[PDB]
Write a protein that binds this DNA or RNA. Structure first.
Lengths: 66, 35, 61, 184, 127
RNA sequence: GGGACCGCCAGUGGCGAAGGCGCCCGGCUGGAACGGGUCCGACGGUGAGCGCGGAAGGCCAGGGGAGCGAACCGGAUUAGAUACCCGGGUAGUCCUGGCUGUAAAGGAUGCGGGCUAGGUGUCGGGCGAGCUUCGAGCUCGCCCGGUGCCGUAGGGAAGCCGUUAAGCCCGCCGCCUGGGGAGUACGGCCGCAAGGCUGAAACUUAAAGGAAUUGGCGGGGGAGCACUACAAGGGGUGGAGCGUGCGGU
């Protein structure tokens, strides 16, 4: 299980088709990109400062286009 | 052969370009069989 | 619009620099203006007011 | 397999470019290495990052054993850089000229100028003519290598802008591309 | 001396091709299309086929003494489209993530000054 | 090697009588506006008859034929495909000489003069201020011409227009007289041809047509709603037997 936990800081807004996917900003707490801030999505309810587990750090979500 | 703009409105009508062309084909064949 | 057209061109009593020659010249010359004695140019024609080079003495209407 | 049959030959930049080392190429035979174009950036040769946009193509032609010596094919500015310069409500003035150098190196150079605003065509003709005569001059007094380096630092573009101020200010004057057509 | 090669990443809306060549671009090292890694023609341009094929070519290059790479992005160019396909970015990320030291990443789409009449007729591809 | 084409610069730039006209240099020519009345002295305006050039495409003769692509040939889609999509592909699209005289060639607005509140930009010429690394190189006012946009009065069924008029006067030319029949029949003239320029009648019709109002609708566009919808989560119908209803007999 090569996973990487990261800490939520800021919530960009409800994303995805149905809004059930939530866009947040997360700081990588361990790994090759320590401290790096990435825009990442969250299925299911989330809050500030949740520890979310990543399989790949490189993947990123496009900026929410209004 | 001075086409009326009124006829170009497709309401209740066929496209004028093709009616013009049909008249021309008819002209062709009629002048042909005449001589 | 002015009812009676008044010319925007005056005439100029001028003194040439070299040979001390007085002359009457035009404000909007269509061609070159040259001195009688020395021959040097006096005012250059352009799109508008001629390009004076000598000294203007008096402005005639 | 074949890939084990290859061996690496080092390349060397032209002498007038400081004879710097850049890279190596694997070849199965030395004869396959000749006339080999290599695309380099002046930041690599001189170390100067400020002029990273400029690129030099070197045609590799001389092989002594494992070592490869090259000739200067040509120069091109970075397309992204040129795109960045070009903006709307601005003119683009392009001067193309074939030219012989003092030492018989024949060449095509085309040069770039951009002003702040939209300019009259005759003034562009004057710009072209002035830059034209200047580059003719610099070709006459300077040989191949020195002229090449003088163009590389762009000081030709500087004097070009200096004289072109007398017709209209220039947002940027430069030499977009250079092709050594043939040698004497 | 650190070894640098060229990674030509061609991307249309139908396929993506990753070709790794020497510094002169005259000798082939690794050349993997989208078709190598998927079984539906529709899937060739997808970013997953892209990143999988790209990683495969990348490890192959690494095995052959390659460490650094200059990326050359390419759209179809010419009269054909100019926007690289959706898989080019994914493949670039994959090449980065496969342990290759990335240098210049530029576009090399040949843009014409005045090209031939494009395809499709006068009234366009009337989808 | 080849043939076409001349990107960004391009704009509500420019020029042209119009269709139309953009790579750089040199030559040849046509002019226009601006400033000067230095000249002539009504030499005008319009134009039936006449004459000229005039997009694409087509045609006659010769060359050329990169790409594209009428016809045509395949693949796919479909109840059907003579299409839309895809793979090719002839005439064409290019140069030379000639013909053909056509288009939503539309500002759907024939041209010349006199008058008529304004606001504002750019284009170009001229003038006057301010700036200046001293290039009419940069900001502001005015005058003239072209080009918009807004707009008073005024017009018009309304759309809208409005000093660049579609308001009011003066000069000339053309065109129009309900709708189809029909831009046809006959005839004439022109063109090698396809066609072009003139062109009726019978008979038949109560409308055709124009502008705008409301609703409606869009396999249009934005905003916002969740339970007769959906996303998260959750139960169960339809397979067996019965109660009861509807159709069926």
């Amino acid at each position: 299980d090569e996973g990487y936990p990261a800490e939520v800081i800021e919530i960009i807004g409800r994303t995805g088709t149905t809004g059930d996917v939530t866009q947040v900003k997360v700081r990588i707490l361990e790994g090759r990109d320590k401290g790096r801030v990435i825009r990442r999505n969250v299925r299911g309810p989330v809050r500030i400062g949740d520890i979310l587990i990543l399989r790949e750090t490189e993947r990123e979500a496009r900026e929410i286009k209004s | 052969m001075k086409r009326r703009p009124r006829k170009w409105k497709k309401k209740g009508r066929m496209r004028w370009k093709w009616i013009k062309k049909r008249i021309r084909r008819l002209k062709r064949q009629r002048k042909k069989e005449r001589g | 619009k002015p009812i009676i057209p008044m010319p925007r061109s005056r005439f100029l009593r001028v003194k040439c620099i070299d040979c001390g020659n007085e002359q009457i010249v035009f404000s909007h010359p269509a061609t070159k203006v040259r001195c009688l004695i020395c021959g040097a140019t006096l005012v250059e024609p352009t799109g508008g007011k001629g390009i004076v080079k000598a000294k203007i003495l008096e402005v005639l209407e | 397999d074949k890939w084990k049959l290859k061996q690496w030959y080092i390349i060397y930049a032209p002498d007038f470019f400081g004879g710097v080392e850049v890279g190596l190429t694997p070849a199965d035979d030395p004869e396959k290495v000749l006339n080999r174009v290599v695309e380099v950036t002046l930041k690599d040769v001189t170390g100067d990052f400020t002029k990273s946009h400029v690129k030099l193509y070197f045609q590799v032609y001389d092989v002594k054993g494992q070592n490869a010596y090259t000739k200067f094919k040509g120069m091109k500015l970075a397309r992204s850089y040129i795109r960045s310069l070009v903006r709307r409500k601005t003119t683009r003035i392009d001067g193309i000229f074939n030219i012989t150098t003092k030492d018989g190196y024949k060449l095509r150079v085309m040069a770039m100028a951009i002003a702040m605003r939209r300019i009259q065509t005759s003034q562009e003709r004057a710009i072209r003519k002035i830059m034209q005569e200047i580059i003719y001059k610099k070709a006459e007094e300077l040989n191949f290598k020195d002229f090449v380096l003088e163009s590389v630092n762009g000081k030709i573009a500087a004097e070009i802008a200096k004289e072109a101020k007398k017709i209209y200010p220039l947002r940027k004057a430069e030499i977009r591309k250079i092709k050594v057509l043939e040698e004497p | 001396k650190e070894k640098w090669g060229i990674a030509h990443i061609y991307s249309s809306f139908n396929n993506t091709i990753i070709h790794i060549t020497d510094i002169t671009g005259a000798e082939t090292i690794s050349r993997w299309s989208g078709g190598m890694v998927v079984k539906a023609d529709r899937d060739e341009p997808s970013p997953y086929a892209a990143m999988l094929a790209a990683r495969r070519a990348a490890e192959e290059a690494l095995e052959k003494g390659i460490v650094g790479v200059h990326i050359r992005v390419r759209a179809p160019g010419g009269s054909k489209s100019k926007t690289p396909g959706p898989g080019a970015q994914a493949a670039i990320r994959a090449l980065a993530r496969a342990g290759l030291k990335i240098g210049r990443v530029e576009d090399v789409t040949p843009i014409p000054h005045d090209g031939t009449r494009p395809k499709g007729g006068r009234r366009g591809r009337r989808v």
